[PDB]
Amino acid sequence: LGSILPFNEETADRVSAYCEKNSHGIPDALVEHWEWTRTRFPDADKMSSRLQGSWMIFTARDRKPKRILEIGCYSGYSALAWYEGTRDTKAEIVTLEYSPKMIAASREAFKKYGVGDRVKLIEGPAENTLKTLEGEFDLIFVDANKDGYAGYVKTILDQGLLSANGIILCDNVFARGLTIGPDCAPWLNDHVRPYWNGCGQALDKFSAGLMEDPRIDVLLLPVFDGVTQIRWKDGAQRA
Amino acid sequence: LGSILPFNEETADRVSAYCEKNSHGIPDALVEHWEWTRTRFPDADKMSSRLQGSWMIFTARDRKPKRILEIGCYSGYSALAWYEGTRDTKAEIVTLEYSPKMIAASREAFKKYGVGDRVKLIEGPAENTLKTLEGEFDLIFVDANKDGYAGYVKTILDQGLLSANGIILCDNVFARGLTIGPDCAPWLNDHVRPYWNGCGQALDKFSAGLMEDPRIDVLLLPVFDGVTQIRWKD
Ligand SMILES: C[S@@+](CC[C@H](N)C(=O)[O-])C[C@H]1O[C@@H](n2cnc3c(N)ncnc32)[C@H](O)[C@@H]1O
Numbered sequence: 107l108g109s110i111l112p113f114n115e116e117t118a119d120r121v122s123a124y125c126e127k128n129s130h131g132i133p134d135a136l137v138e139h140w141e142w143t144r145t146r147f148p149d150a151d152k153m154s155s156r157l158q159g160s161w162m163i164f165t166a167r168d169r170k171p172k173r174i175l176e177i178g179c180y181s182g183y184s185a186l187a188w189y190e191g192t193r194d195t196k197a198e199i200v201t202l203e204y205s206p207k208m209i210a211a212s213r214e215a216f217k218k219y220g221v222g223d224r225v226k227l228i229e230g231p232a233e234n235t236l237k238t239l240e241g242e243f244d245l246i247f248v249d250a251n252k253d254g255y256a257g258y259v260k261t262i263l264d265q266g267l268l269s270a271n272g273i274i275l276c277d278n279v280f281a282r283g284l285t286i287g288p289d290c291a292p293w294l295n296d297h298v299r300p301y302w303n304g305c306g307q308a309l310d311k312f313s314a315g316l317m318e319d320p321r322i323d324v325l326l327l328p329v330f331d332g333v334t335q336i337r338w339k340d341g342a343q344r345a
Numbered sequence: 346l347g348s349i350l351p352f353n354e355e356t357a358d359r360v361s362a363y364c365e366k367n368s369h370g371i372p373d374a375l376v377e378h379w380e381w382t383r384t385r386f387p388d389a390d391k392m393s394s395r396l397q398g399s400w401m402i403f404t405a406r407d408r409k410p411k412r413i414l415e416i417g418c419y420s421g422y423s424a425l426a427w428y429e430g431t432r433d434t435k436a437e438i439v440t441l442e443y444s445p446k447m448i449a450a451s452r453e454a455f456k457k458y459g460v461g462d463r464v465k466l467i468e469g470p471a472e473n474t475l476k477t478l479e480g481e482f483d484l485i486f487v488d489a490n491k492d493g494y495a496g497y498v499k500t501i502l503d504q505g506l507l508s509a510n511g512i513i514l515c516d517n518v519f520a521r522g523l524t525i526g527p528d529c530a531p532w533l534n535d536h537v538r539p540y541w542n543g544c545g546q547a548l549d550k551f552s553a554g555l556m557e558d559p560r561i562d563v564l565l566l567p568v569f570d571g572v573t574q575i576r577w578k579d
């Protein structure tokens with residue numbers, strides 16, 4: 107017997123709303139941006155939920171990372187969440203994006219909310235830009251093209267972009283269920299099914315790939331749309 | 346926009362198995378303990394899952410808490426998970442339990458597992474023993490009587506049992522879904538429904554009450570059977 111509660115769609119949404127009601131909310135400015143994004147780019151099926159926003163903020167407040175990297179800025183929603191949760195450390199927040207339209211939206215939003223002091227938007231395909239980064243990050247949020255996750259994590263590990271005390275959080279690992287199997291998301295809108303099916307195939311390869319890497323500890327948590335947590339294994343204790 | 350994937354029972358179990366397959370497993374000795382518990386005890390449904398085991402070990406390896414407190418030892422599974430995730434720091438692990446049977450079972454398992462005295466089982470009702478504890482804990486795992494979670498957390502916060510950079514993790518806050526509403530767990534067996542429905546009403550009051558406390562940051566995470574994360578506000 108497993109670790110996941112079975113809910114139908116309606117009930118899952120009610121439990122989601124209950125979580126939002128009984129968790130501290132995201133700031134008003136972030137709600138403003140969230141509603142703006144959803145309206146301006148309708149049914150894109152891309153931005154994180156309000157509760158995920160709360161989770162991001164809580165996580166940064168808790169962990170107090172010195173530097174944050176995220177891959178896949180979109181409209182800047184998660185970037186703003188990381189910003190909110192790191193006001194005390196004034197962490198640098200590096201975010202990568204390739205879409206010209208979403209770059210413009212994110213720059214506009216970053217200017218509106220005055221977060222330019224430590225949010226740095228790096229433009230271009232992350233396959234090109236990620237490897238150009240220097241130093242290390244205490245928290246890395248991977249939330250871009252699902253077919254690219256393996257390549258991104260590989261660069262992150264091989265170039266030491268993940269700090270000794272850090273964590274990588276990879277989003278949407280379940281691909282709505284389709285990472286696990288073709289029959290695991292019967293509720294899914296058929297119009298997005300082939301997209302998520304392709305993502306699931308890549309993410310299944312990704313997930314199996316991580317289990318072969320002796321350098322890291324790995325946990326796939328069944329929360330939201332699946333979140334893989336990655337850290338370096340403990341350093342050598344004795345000579 | 347929802348934050349929870351809908352799964353039927355069979356599919357949820359399959360996705361659980363997938364997570365287990367693609368997460369580092371718990372140590373063989375802890376697998377052994379888990380199986381032993383499932384075999385020897387009729388009420389072994391009280392014990393955390395294997396995947397929850399990996400999550401506990403990972404969380405401890407990650408955060409490296411120096412002192413861990415858990416409420417609700419049962420057979421010692423989660424205590425041994427915390428133990429395994431803190432071999433590098435030799436973190437102290439304090440675990441509260443009131444059942445005479447499970448106290449004996451846990452001491453036997455701890456002795457057999459070969460843990461040292463950094464694992465401390467404190468016997469008695471937690472309402473009484475929690476108050477006697479001194480110092481602070483970097484990670485607190487609340488996993489005992491659901492009707493008492495509010496009191497436990499209040500005591501923890503009032504007495505400063507939670508360190509400034511610590512986290513409280515409260516388990517099973519959804520009560521299989523019945524915390525949210527009486528119709529949210531149609532798959533539950535009739536004979537356990539009164540138990541979970543009672544827990545659900547208590548946990549709902551608990552969840553609401555946390556939102557009234559100006560001292561803490563609160564996140565109710567929709568993972569496993571619901572995990573409430575609590576920290577001191579900065
Ligand atoms: C799911 S959205 C991220 C949403 C955002 N992190 C949030 O929480 O609201 C994925 C983003 O990654 C971007 N993206 C996809 N492939 C990319 C690539 N190869 N390089 C850089 N960005 C990419 C997309 O344009 C999109 O904005």
Ligand SMILES: C[S@@+](CC[C@H](N)C(=O)[O-])C[C@H]1O[C@@H](n2cnc3c(N)ncnc32)[C@H](O)[C@@H]1O
Pocket residue numbers: 391392393416417418419420421422423424441442443444447469470471472488489490493
């Ligand atoms: C859900 S089990 C804990 C399982 C364990 N943490 C694990 O992960 O395997 C709850 C335990 O709390 C104990 N318990 C219930 N009420 C208690 C109380 N008021 N004081 C101390 N222990 C209590 C029960 O005897 C039971 O062993």
Ligand SMILES: [Mg+2]
Pocket residue numbers: 169408
């Ligand atoms: Mg830390």
